[PDB]
Amino acid sequence: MGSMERASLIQKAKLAEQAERYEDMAAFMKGAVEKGEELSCEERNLLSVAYKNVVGGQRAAWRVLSSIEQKGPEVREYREKVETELQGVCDTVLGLLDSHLIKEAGDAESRVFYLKMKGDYYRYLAEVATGDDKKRIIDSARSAYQEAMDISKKEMPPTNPIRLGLALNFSVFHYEIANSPEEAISLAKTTFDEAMADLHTLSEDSYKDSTLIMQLLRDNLTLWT
Amino acid sequence: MGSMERASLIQKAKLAEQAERYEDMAAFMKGAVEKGEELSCEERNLLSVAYKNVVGGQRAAWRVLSSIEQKGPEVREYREKVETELQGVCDTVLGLLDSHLIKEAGDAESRVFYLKMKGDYYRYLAEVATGDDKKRIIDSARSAYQEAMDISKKEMPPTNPIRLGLALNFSVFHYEIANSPEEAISLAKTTFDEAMADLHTLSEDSYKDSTLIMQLLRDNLTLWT
Amino acid sequence: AGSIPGRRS
């Protein structure tokens, strides 16, 4: 995408989302990141939406194939093919974050957003990991989420949607990856309760955003308890 | 896919469908066709399912982008990119049919199936065509559907699901491509009525198949009248 | 108008 203008890549990412062409969307946003400039709030969301949808489809396919495999070499070979593709996309996202989105992100909102992404893509790698580096992958996810949590608690109100989504995802990490269901439940409960107590400060539109994510926390708590 | 066994390609196409990985499915089935052997009934369905789903998603995206365009150069450029990809997939399918599925298909069921596909992929090309060859593309679709119709009327009962689906699709061609809504309505009505009169000959499972497609014909008639 | 689906569903 080196020959396309940054603004054109952003415009085409928005069109790709409208057309539900998420692989294209991700390629346009990778090109935009590689222009070397920082991303605005809206642009960060385009980047996340694109890759979350691409990897989300790969994860769903990997889960279908892994179930069939658990129940000739073809099933294993094809699960491995999908797994390698998934790992490649995660590595690409992590590479964008490391070169050089995180290091240039100084504001709490941007830095937390990117560290949350870093935790998420290591978590997706951990979902399929089985080898000698699996513990290190889990710890890489944990470390990214923890740094994001530390910044968010110092710099953002408890209703901030990025802070809430980070806590939501880190709680999923604890439950599904780290074998720490009590930590997952504790984090979700404390996050929900501290957000509830801060809703009185919010406008109608901010209230809607914060309560939407609070409901996602509650949905998980209902499933886990 | 030249190094993968035919049977493994077929097995992986089935897995890809279960995982909703239709691009993979199409690539596996292209590899299977390129082994040079004829396809069984089940294998013909795998080929059609794979490419119908791939091109169906491209068509939906092209329609979103074409609507935005009708309402800088970026929208046109991106619509053109999706259009070229769509044309490439249609050309690939038509190439498989021409080399050499149709020429080796002697039984009415296989030959009608492939000629129906040929009509469909020329119809998809016609949906996006605007240049000097647009009339020829439309006529190529018409000619393929017509040959399939002629064989089906001589060799298949009026309830045969391939005969019914062919008539359904040719009726859509008349309405949406050829600007012949009366021909579309006449074909759908006569097809429906002749199938109705033959249902008494069918088993429960065949009855279910034929009535399902009859309902699709009726749905179109209700929309068109 | 609808054309034939890939599968009965």
Added chain:
Amino acid sequence: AGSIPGRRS
């Protein structure tokens, strides 16, 4: 359990 969606929808 659910993680954050890409968009509010």
